[PDB]
A = this chain, B = another copy of it.
Amino acid sequence: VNQQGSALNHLTSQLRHNFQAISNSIQAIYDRLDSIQADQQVDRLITGRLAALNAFVSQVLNKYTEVRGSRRLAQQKINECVKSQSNRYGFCGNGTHIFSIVNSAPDGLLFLHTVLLPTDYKNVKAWSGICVDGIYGYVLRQPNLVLYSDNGVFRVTSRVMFQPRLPVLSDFVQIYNCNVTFVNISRVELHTVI
Contact = CB atoms under 8 A, between A and B. Distances in A.
Interface of A: 17, 19-20, 44, 47, 55, 58-59, 62, 65-66, 69, 75-76, 78-80, 83-84, 88-90
Contacts of A76: 90
Main secondary structure of the interface of A (DSSP, over half): helix
A90 B69 contact: no
Contacts of A65: 66
Contacts of A75: 90
Nearest to A83: B89
Nearest to A70: B69
Contacts of A62: 62
Nearest to A50: B17
A80 B89 contact: yes
A84 B79 contact: no
Contact of A89 (B20, B44, B69, B79): B79
Contacts of A79: 89-90
* Residue among A47, A75, A83, A90 with the highest chain B CB neighbour number at 10 A: A90
